[PDB]
């Protein structure tokens, strides 16, 4: 009883298909040769579910309006990927400081990617951790993985070259 329901989408749904497309078309090679997240060019999409939670949605839209009004009515809202071992907390409790990376490059915040394959590197933790629970294989082709595709308010974003 968290308030969260997961609505399963059909593969025939226009909305399943555009989310899958964004997932598949933003795969790239990584400078570690696949070390953290595995060696692949594409995914097998198995399921896509919508995350519905009225409280967490209102919490998001309330902050969006704050940011918007501090930035000439421009939330600068994107759809971005998030991979984390805490995806199950996140979908039930929402994002908070337990999902931030204290040791991150750009500070102690919550990190999102335009490249799905980048988020794929944190599904099993920092650096890919030890890989999947069952095989300890960061390149497991067997075990199922989960990513979030999230709605993110960037507001006035500080540009950092790197």
């Amino acid at each position: 009883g968290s308030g969260t329901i997961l609505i399963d989408l059909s593969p025939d749904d226009k909305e399943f298909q555009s989310v899958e497309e964004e997932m598949q078309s933003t795969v790239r090679e990584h400078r570690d040769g696949g070390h953290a997240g595995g060696i692949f060019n594409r995914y097998n999409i198995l399921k896509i579910q919508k995350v519905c939670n009225k409280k967490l949605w209102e919490r998001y839209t309330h902050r969006r309006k704050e940011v918007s009004e501090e930035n000439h009515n421009h939330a600068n809202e994107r759809m971005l990927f998030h991979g984390s071992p805490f995806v199950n907390a996140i979908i039930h409790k929402g994002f908070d400081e337990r999902h931030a990376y204290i040791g991150g490059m750009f500070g102690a915040g919550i990190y999102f990617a335009e490249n799905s394959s980048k988020s794929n590197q944190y599904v099993y933790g920092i650096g890919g951790g030890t890989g999947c629970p069952v095989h300890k294989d960061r390149s497991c082709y067997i075990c199922h993985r989960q990513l979030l595709f999230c709605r993110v308010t960037l507001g006035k974003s500080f540009l950092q070259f790197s």
């Binding site: 097998n44 969006r64 996140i90 999102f112 067997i142 199922h144 993985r145 999230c150 960037l154």
Partner: protein, 47 residues
């Protein structure tokens, strides 16, 4: 949790060397993201 740079709401990490890489972003308030879709998948072995 850190704070955003003053007068900012997030940080864009621009890809600098990697020609093919897209941007990465950071927010410092969890209220600035909502998890809309949960995607279950497998990576696929290249043939």
């Amino acid at each position: 949790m850190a704070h955003s740079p003053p007068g900012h709401h997030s940080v864009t990490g621009r890809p600098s060397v990697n020609g093919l890489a897209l941007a990465e972003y950071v927010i410092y308030r969890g209220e600035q993201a909502y998890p809309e879709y949960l995607i279950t998948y497998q990576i696929m072995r290249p043939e």
